[PDB]
Amino acid sequence: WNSRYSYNQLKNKDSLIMFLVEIFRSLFVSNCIDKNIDNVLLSIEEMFIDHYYNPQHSRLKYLIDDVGIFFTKLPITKAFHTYNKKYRITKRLYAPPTFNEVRHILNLAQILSLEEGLDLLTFDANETLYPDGHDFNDEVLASYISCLLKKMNIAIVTAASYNNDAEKYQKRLENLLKYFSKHNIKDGSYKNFYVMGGESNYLFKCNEEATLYSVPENEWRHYKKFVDYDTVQEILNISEKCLEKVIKDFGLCAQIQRKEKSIGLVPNKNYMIKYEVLEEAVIRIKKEIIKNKITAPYCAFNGGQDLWVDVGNKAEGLLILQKLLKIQKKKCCHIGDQFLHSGNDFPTRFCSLTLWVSNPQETKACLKSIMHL
Amino acid sequence: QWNSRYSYNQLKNKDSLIMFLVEIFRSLFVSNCIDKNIDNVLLSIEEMFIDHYYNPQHSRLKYLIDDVGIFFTKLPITKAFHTYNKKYRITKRLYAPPTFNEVRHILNLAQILSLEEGLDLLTFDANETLYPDGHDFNDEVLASYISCLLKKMNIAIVTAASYNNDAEKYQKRLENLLKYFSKHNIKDGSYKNFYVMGGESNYLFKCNEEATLYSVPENEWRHYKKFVDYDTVQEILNISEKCLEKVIKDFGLCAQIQRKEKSIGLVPNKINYMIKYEVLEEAVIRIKKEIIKNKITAPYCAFNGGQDLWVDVGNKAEGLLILQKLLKIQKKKCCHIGDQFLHSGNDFPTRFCSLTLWVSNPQETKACLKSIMHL
Amino acid sequence: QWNSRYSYNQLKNKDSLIMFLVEIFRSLFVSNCIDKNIDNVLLSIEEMFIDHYYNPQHSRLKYLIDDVGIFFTKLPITKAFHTYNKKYRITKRLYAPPTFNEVRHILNLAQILSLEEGLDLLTFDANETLYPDGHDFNDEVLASYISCLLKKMNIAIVTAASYNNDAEKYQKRLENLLKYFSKHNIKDGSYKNFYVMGGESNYLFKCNEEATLYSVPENEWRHYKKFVDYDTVQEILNISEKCLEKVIKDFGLCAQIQRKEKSIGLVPNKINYMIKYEVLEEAVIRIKKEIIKNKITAPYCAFNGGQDLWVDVGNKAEGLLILQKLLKIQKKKCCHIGDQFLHSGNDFPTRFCSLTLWVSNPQETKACLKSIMHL
Amino acid sequence: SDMKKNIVQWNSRYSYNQLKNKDSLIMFLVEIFRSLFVSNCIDKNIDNVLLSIEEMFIDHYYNPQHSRLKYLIDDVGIFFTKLPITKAFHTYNKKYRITKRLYAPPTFNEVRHILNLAQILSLEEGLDLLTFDANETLYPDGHDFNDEVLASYISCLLKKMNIAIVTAASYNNDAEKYQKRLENLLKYFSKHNIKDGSYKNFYVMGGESNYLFKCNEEATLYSVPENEWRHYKKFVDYDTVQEILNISEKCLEKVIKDFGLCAQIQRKEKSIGLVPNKIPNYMIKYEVLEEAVIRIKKEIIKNKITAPYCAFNGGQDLWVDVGNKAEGLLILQKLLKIQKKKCCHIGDQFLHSGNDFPTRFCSLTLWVSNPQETKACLKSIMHLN
Ligand SMILES: O=c1[nH]cnc2c1ncn2[C@@H]1O[C@H](COP(=O)(O)O)[C@@H](O)[C@H]1O
Ligand SMILES: O=c1[nH]cnc2c1ncn2[C@@H]1O[C@H](COP(=O)(O)O)[C@@H](O)[C@H]1O
Ligand SMILES: O=c1[nH]cnc2c1ncn2[C@@H]1O[C@H](COP(=O)(O)O)[C@@H](O)[C@H]1O
Ligand SMILES: O=c1[nH]cnc2c1ncn2[C@@H]1O[C@H](COP(=O)(O)O)[C@@H](O)[C@H]1O
Ligand SMILES: [Mg+2]
Ligand SMILES: [Mg+2]
Ligand SMILES: [Mg+2]
Ligand SMILES: [Mg+2]
């Protein structure tokens, strides 16, 4: 699930997205991008199916060595037409398609592949629902989530750990539960709504009063991979020792914060820390946990201007709900922003469909496209 | 010297000089020797930058990097890396290599230390470097750094914004700046050393002793400008507007065409609806390639900046060229500060006539000025 | 006309137009659609090759590739692809994309199929495209093609080989070709359409009724040669000679310098001790950068042969211009076959005044002539 | 890892990106030397950079799985010795003076030479077994041994260490047919080596790990009893050999129909080959041969065959052998009780889809282009003591 951290894996943006960018770029250069390129697009699709069936020996694997596993047949041809007709990006003559645009097309393809249905949908609460640290105050998208909960399960998986205090999480979602009591409380859908804490440590359901409450540990401790309490603390001690050198190596205005099953450094009044120092820290931390031969599920991610290390994994959270709610991976989806190799949403590619979002407005465009299907 | 070199390599690849240094530091990073005395590497890079100042078209640097700008000064790249590294210690990194923005600051500091001969003119890009885009200047810290520099040399505000000759609408954009000038820059003769250039090189302004900007007559400095008649200025507009109408049609865009004397813009409206960044690039080249189709050699500039497109019949290099001819200061002692230093930006042509400092936000301009004053 | 410069990036990728097609085909190969009906991609490429022929200054091909030369003819790249594909089926490859050299064969074929209007002059690099380096002509198959082609057009031998001005030396190179001309090309007047240009563009020779070369009177063709005086010729030789004498020292070369009137070169000692190809490519750029440093503007050429280096006062581009002005031949009716079309090769400047076929061995030239005869 | 795992990853975990760059480690040094040349500092004293490169090489000798070198280059081999890349650069540059170049950077082939020289200098602890790729490194492709100078070096080394010849040539068990390829070498061995006991130290391996021969006191080559060394080799069922041979054979037929080729299919026991038709020899495209090797490999895994094989490109030939040169080296290391640190191999096919590539998994390797380069190696090897 990790330990494949390579130099080449860091400097290059994305294996799959750039793969389509370079093909579109050459198509743009040959001046044939506006003509019917269905022959090219379907051959791209012909591979995506061959990678769905034989993901270990597909030709897509020979071209791109580090491809994730495809859980559905991706209609990349329909995804291009639908995105093209709306934005007319092919109408350009001097500006090639952008990595960001191909990520948009790739996300649309994963939505159309859900023609068989969708049983579970999860969100990365931070920066995909509301900016870093801010509270939920966008009333528009809350109507989308309420409608989808009527036809599927909705979960919130966010690396923010507030221990087991269920009351603290409501302040982050008070406006959301307010919309649930007005519509979902009459329906029978409110019980299908869950919230995950840490990355996979604190689970809360939803009561009849649109109130978040803790879940008995005996209801899902067997679904979670049991980890020695001594090993958990060791991971934090390895991290706490590593961050001190990081703050000592580069003189910076921050300090370390300790919790139960999670630690991270946060800049104090705040004085920003370079994006590369946080990148350096994740690889420093990972190489040490490798050196100590720790196999427990963990994660270290570079999100915004703070670094954290949790003894949970955002993929284990999806794995718990699937084993708990009797849901397959092919009918599971997750929306997040940290989809780089130093992000905590990347592990979700190993067990669920994924949608890469840069700001909460794109989640509105994501769910809006999902609904009209 | 028309900037007509619209090249696919200019759009596809970033700054030539910066990425040249990044790859070198990357090999120094990968070889594990970046934390040792790498002075032998840095000295040869300086040896190259020195010879480029002498033979810019036959240097080994121009053979390596074709399409280099021009070095108006001898650049101390060794001392700049030495002093940048001591503050941030990027070199103590083991798994993340030196990045693009880091070398951007190193080259900025390299240009700053090159002013051992002295500095006689500063220019500031108004929007995005002195205040956020579409805002009024609201900063007391920045104005305090500028005030001390105003006594040492002449300072100018060269912007791309255009209000037609109305000096009252310009002081509104930088109210708190004149307020600080009213307090500390009146007794000194520095009040007669501050300039403001609206449009792009079209509307020149100055400061009165009562600290409210006044517009300078046209007949005093219009002769320094390139003679562009009113008929050709409007065809550059007309051809542009015809191209923007195609852009509103070719792409579903909720955008308005703002027409003024000597300028055309592309602005959306809120129900603002954000235009795609890549269409802006596509439209800039459409306008430039269409103007050359009519053999128009008039100094113009079409640029995508922030969230809107504007085409001015002035040039932001002309503005710096005007002030160099007015105050009789060679290009060696003139420096510019802006955020639009890509091929699509409007601060780029100043590389042809003045030293340049690449900045992304107002906080870096304050960090720029603080280092420029400990000289 | 002037000989253009070079960037270190331009020295890497041998030909930009060829490389421009390779990366397109590679994305076609990568996308799994290479062996399907890809004519939309092919015809669109032809659309830019046509638009660059009609408007070479402002074309999208000029926009994407900055150093694109001049298309003297409409290039049928779509038919050339199908033709080369049907023979070798390079599109049936699944795990290896089409190569640089394969596109070279296609680009040559597209240039050949563009000659539907006709040819008036065909020229041959003598060394390495008619016979191995430094050998006498020995091939009857190839001789029949040149013989049959000498009936329908003019045929000239343009080689940088310099034997001053005695046709006996040049005949030893082309003995077996001239004896074949006696048996078939004398009953008619075809031998009066054969030429041999000595020393790139310094010596001219014609054929004679006895199947023997003679030197054309200097007055008959000297006015087209851009005059270069004894002083300027000797400055180029001396500036070069000084460079080679350092090139020998720095790398401890086992080689010698050979001086002639209007030419100088670096030859290995007899034993034939191999001399590094990298040092040869360096000696070109060392000399070229020195000649331009001394403001020399005369037509010269420093080229990197297989096992030696040579500098010649004159070049094959001017040599073709001499023949085109001699026989009143238009540019669009000219063609040249050579082996070194790298930027440091004496056949590269022909791109500026003729159509070109890039070959690497005498076997590849027969494939060109057989394809040319079958039209 | 274990050799069975390496062969599994070699014939099943290639990549288009990895097959583009010939060697990941040579390209590693080329990029660094490129920037050093681009930075203009490459002609000054650069022990600054080189020593740091050596430092990472040493850390990789001790910690191959979690080293900084393995971070930068994902697919590094395993270093059996400490490479003095600083001395190899000093030694190679003082001869050729490639740092005096101002407008031409060092090439892949030069860094390949420096890396060979570093591998040679790493043999300070001594050498006990030296093996040679026969075709194109001892004599041109398809020829017989007709070089006197080479025999003088090999005979001199034969007195000091064990010598072997691992080749892809596959004459079933006719030692007279192998003698014809090297008769001038055994002719020199008879004149200068029968006096020593060194002729017993000389071995020849046919097939690729299938046939073995030793030198007689009469300088003649004789077959080695299979009861003496069959056990060291991983056994392959007769049904699985012909399965490999047949699944390959079907592909060469498709390659001839796809691309119109004047070529034939030679069938032997434990070996198939795609050989070209005679001229009245025709030439087969290099990219087609490279294409078919991937075609062979891609289909063998589709049939879930895991036996050790080797599909390889021989310049003008395409062959598949049940067996590989890494297996043949293991058998000689198990036969003469020789550790990998004191064994070396010289060959020309060190690319992926190459004959001598699996040698990197169990020996020191020298990447040589022709017998003239083979001499420069053995000349530098003799200069050690
Ligand atoms: O251990 C935790 N305790 C409190 N906050 C955390 C913890 N881990 C991550 N965070 C922060 O909360 C957010 C969680 O990331 P997410 O996966 O995008 O929701 C980020 O802004 C983190 O900086
Ligand atoms: O002609 C003009 N009239 C009014 N606004 C303009 C004009 N030209 C540019 N602008 C806007 O004002 C900004 C000034 O750019 P800057 O001062 O160069 O950073 C531009 O980015 C546009 O948003
Ligand atoms: O100046 C000259 N005099 C005599 N031989 C020359 C001269 N210049 C070049 N050569 C040799 O003749 C060859 C002509 O090559 P070509 O131009 O490709 O025909 C060169 O590669 C040199 O070996
Ligand atoms: O199985 C085989 N039997 C006979 N000849 C072979 C066989 N395999 C390859 N060959 C040819 O013989 C050469 C010997 O290979 P090498 O000795 O490893 O260089 C190859 O390059 C092929 O041309
Ligand atoms: Mg997030
Ligand atoms: Mg700006
Ligand atoms: Mg030649
Ligand atoms: Mg071999």
Residue numbers in the entry:
A (entry chain A): 47 to 315, 327 to 430
B (entry chain B), C (entry chain D): 46 to 316, 327 to 430
D (entry chain C): 38 to 317, 327 to 431
Publication excerpt:
Maintaining the optimal nucleotide balance required for normal cell proliferation is controlled by 5′-nucleotidases amongst other processes. These enzymes catalyze the dephosphorylation of ribo- and deoxyribonucleoside monophosphates to their corresponding nucleosides, and also exhibit, in certain cases phosphotransferase activity. All structures adopt a tetrameric assembly displaying a cross-like shape, in agreement with the quaternary solution structure. Each subunit consists of four domains: an “N-Terminal Regulatory Domain” (NTRD, M1 to K59), an “OD” (D60 to T143), a HAD-like Catalytic Domain (CD, F144 to K270 and K371 to Q444) and a C2 cap domain13 (K271 to N370).
The crystal structures confirm that the IMP-Mg2+ substrate is mainly coordinated by conserved residues from the four HAD motifs, and by W365, which is situated on β-strand I. The base moiety of the nucleotide is stabilized by a π-stacking interaction with W365 and by three hydrogen bonds with A205 (Motif II), S207 and D367. Hydroxyl groups 2′ and 3′ of the sugar moiety form hydrogen bonds with D363 and D178, respectively, whereas the phosphate moiety of the nucleotide forms hydrogen bonds with D170 (Motif I), T204 and A205 (Motif II), K371 (Motif III), and N401 (Motif IV). Mg2+ is coordinated by the phosphate moiety, side chains of D170 (Motif I), D394 and Q395 (Motif IV), and the main chain carbonyl of D/N172. After IMP-Mg2+ or Mg2+ binding (PfISN1D172N-IMP, PfISN1WT-Mg2+), helix α8 restructures into a loop and orients the E173 side chain to accommodate the substrate. Concurrently, side chains of D178 and D394 flip into the catalytic pocket to coordinate the substrate while the breakage of the salt bridge between E173 and H398 induces a complete reorganization of the segment between D394 and F407 engendering α-helix D402-F407. Concomitantly, the four subunits bend even more than in the PfISN1-ATP conformation to adopt the most closed form observed. In this latter conformation, we do not observe the NTRDs as seen in PfISN1-Apo and PfISN1-ATP structures. Indeed, the four NTRDs are relocated at interfaces 2 beneath SegmentD394-F407. Despite adding ATP prior to crystallization, ATP molecules are not observed in PfISN1D172N-IMP structure. As concerns the IMP-binding stoichiometry, we observed that in the PfISN1D172N-IMP structure, each subunit binds one IMP-Mg2+, a feature also observed in the PfISN1D172N-ΔN30-IMP structure.
